[PDB]
Amino acid sequence: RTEKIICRDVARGYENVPIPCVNGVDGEPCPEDYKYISENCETSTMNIDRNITHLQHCTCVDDCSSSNCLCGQLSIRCWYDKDGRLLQEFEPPLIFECNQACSCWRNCKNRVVQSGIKVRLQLYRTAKMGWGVRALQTIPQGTFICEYVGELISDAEADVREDDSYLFDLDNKDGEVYCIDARYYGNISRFINHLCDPNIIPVRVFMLHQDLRFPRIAFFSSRDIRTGEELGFDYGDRFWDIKSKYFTCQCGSEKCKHSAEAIALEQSRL
Template sequence: MANIWQKMELFFGKAHSSKTKSSSSANAEKNTKQEELLHSQQKEIATPQKVNKNGKSKGKRKKDKDDVDKKKRRKEKKSRRLVSLESSDSNSSCTVSFSDYPDTPMPKNKDGHSAELKERPSMVKGRRRLLDSFLEESTDKQIDSVICRDISRDRERIPVPVVNNVDTTPAPDDFLYITNSCETQPLYVDANITNLSACDCEDECMTSSCSCAVNSVQCWYGKDGRLVSDLNILTGTPLIFECNRRCRCYVSKCFNRVVQKGMQYQLQIYRTEKTGWGIRSMEFIPRGSFVCEYVGELITDEQADLRADTYLFDLENKNYDVFCLDGRYYGNVSRFINHSCHPNIAPLRVFVEHQDLRCPRVAFFACTDIAAYEQLG
């Protein structure tokens, strides 16, 4: 029996010791995990997380292959610089310049011709070249300092700006801008509507059935609003009678109404180097087009003899009393037209509101093609 009890004590003693050892190892592992968790929490407190616009923390995500590829493509796109591309529809080559992009296939035009690879200039040289081209373009197009937005003060259908790149002379303001000639004393111009010859055309007022065209010998305007090609302005022409307020023709269809519609092209008053103020066109004006009308104060020949002839325009009526237009105190953009030995505009006598032959309207038409920024004279 003693042996049995000794064996039992030995057995239960070993079991107790093994149980004690296992429980102690489990406690040690548990303590280790708690220490690691506490260490990680302290680390998170020490390093604050990044926060987006909405106040939420940004979670970390692993970099995958797509992110690396996106960054690579972004760098390649940024390094590529297209410098010039000159392509043509013919068999001529298409010229392209790239840098740092050797694996890209050469572009081709629609004829299948490959591009030539040019040496790319540096960014500084590229900006300098762009600035030089801008300055050249600025010189060609005359970038001006505008000193008056519209000298007519919205009286013309197209604004008339004033520019001065020569000196400090301000915009001229020593006259009253008008769009129709005026009188400062009665001259008894026959403007009675019952004395006007009028038409009642149903067509475009370009045939011999139009009484206004018959008064002018023929209709001198084409469908494009310009003088017909067989009219030589410089050798003199008959009087032009446009359709008037008494005519029954359709205004929208009538081609015999040009001067009465006013200016159609952009003009500019500018300071010249030698001749004071002048006028130039801001756009191309084809031959035969109406440019502007000489407007001023209608005076008699006796009054004109007492005034300076700087702005006088003689109406030259041989069979009637002679009248003049003076643009000194009342005028429009045409008062700044300078004399030219090689004129590009010529005056024609036109009648619209009345048909009193003593007082025609003076309309300037282009006797040649006028380029943009070309002075009128």
């Protein structure tokens, strides 16, 4: 079967690079049951707090490469190297990027996620998991890949929605909990599958606002990724505790944690 190129760019020119779609597996058409958006949207009043006087910001007169940058100090257990790659000390990490209130320039060293997608990605048809996303180039460890983009909703709204296959919990620790639902509006990340041996990790980030209800979700590679490799992250135990009643994991890894056999083995261990 020929691998048919079925869309030149599912993002319609909204990303820095096109994201084509191919299907060399079956007759499924390019997915159109959602609206591609490159940035989060709202379908009710969220009214993000963008008060420029509310932003913590730096006074750097350099490129924000020094440890004296306030924005770098606010970041929790992570930092960017000179090439824009994320390093972590391993409480989850939290990135405060520079913003419109900082004295620094738009091209300072603390601007990775807000600068958008730089790697070549492809939406493709997987053998067993529906659509997936793969790299069209080698990607070094720590590289920004893409953001989890969708519809901002409250946790109460997330609990009542019927299709939970695209729901990302922001897991707010101080205040009400919010979610990003990519079922109806989303970007390329809605197609990233779960892998028990993941090669990307989600990290919460603040950029042009510091409204604590709404960290933005940035995926970074957790190891060097080879051309053609499917991208995947660990959806987490909570997802699988709910979804395993309907389907089990087909990642195929020797260390798979969510297959029918793994679940039975975990039930025996407990």
